[PDB]
Amino acid sequence: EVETFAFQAEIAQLMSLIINTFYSNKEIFLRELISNSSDALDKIRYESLTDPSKLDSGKELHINLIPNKQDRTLTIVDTGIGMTKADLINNLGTIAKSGTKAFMEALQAGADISMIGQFGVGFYSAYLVAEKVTVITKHNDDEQYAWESSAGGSFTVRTDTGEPMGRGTKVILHLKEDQTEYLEERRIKEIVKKHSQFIGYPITLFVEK
């Protein structure tokens, strides 16, 4: 059972700008997703300070980067707070309507796409490199759900029957044909060292057979 939703007009416009603007510095997508994961880990850590049972769904707080050349996917896994179904539908827990408004005013006033994270909509920078994005998520207060969009103005949400996650979020980037450099170990390490050196959680880059 799959529910199909229309993006709010402003979010559709944000995604088409990201997809269509000529902009070579695409590697910042990874910094934005890692920073989102760090924010989600901060949230569950703060909740656990006063309620240790919040970590019954998993005590480890970390970020994994899993490239898969056979599937042409890069997956960013975190064990953060996760998102409820309502969160997913409401622009993946972001204030994306007002953030898009500010971002596009900034762009016409000198800014570039790399500053997207300052406006709270850094998730959508995934579409700099991915033709499709799947988000699998589990929050302590809800069931496991899968969000998916190939842009084009709509997204789907369904209950996830895949491998149970415990708690957290998985962002699966189905990469564009000409963006497979982001599956190469040396390129991913370079980007993590350049842009994510002060993230306060272990970031593990998986290797492939």
Minimal distance, residue 110 CB to ligand A1AYK, in Å: 27
Q: In terms of CB distance, is 10 or 39 closer to ligand A1AYK?
A: 39
If the CB atoms of residues 60 and 178 are measured against ligand A1AYK, the closer one turns out to be 60
In the complex, the smallest distance separating the C-beta of residue 46 from ligand A1AYK, rounded to whole angstroms, is 11
Q: Which long-range contacts (CB under 8 A, 24 or more apart) does 146-154 make?
A: 147/88, 147/92, 149/7, 151/12, 151/15, 151/16, 151/19, 151/127, 153/6, 153/7, 153/12, 154/4, 154/5, 154/6, 154/7
**Is 123 known to sit in a ligand binding site?**
yes
Strand partners, 137: 145, 169
Cβ distance 144 to 165 under 8 Å? yes
Q: In angstroms, what is the minimal distance from the CB of 83 to ligand A1AYK? A: 5
Residues contributing to the site for ligand A1AYK (CB under 6 A): 36-37, 39-40, 43, 78, 80-81, 83, 92-93, 123, 135, 169, 171
36 among annotated binding-site residues:
yes
Binding region for ATP:
36, 78, 97, 123
Binding region:
36, 78, 97, 123
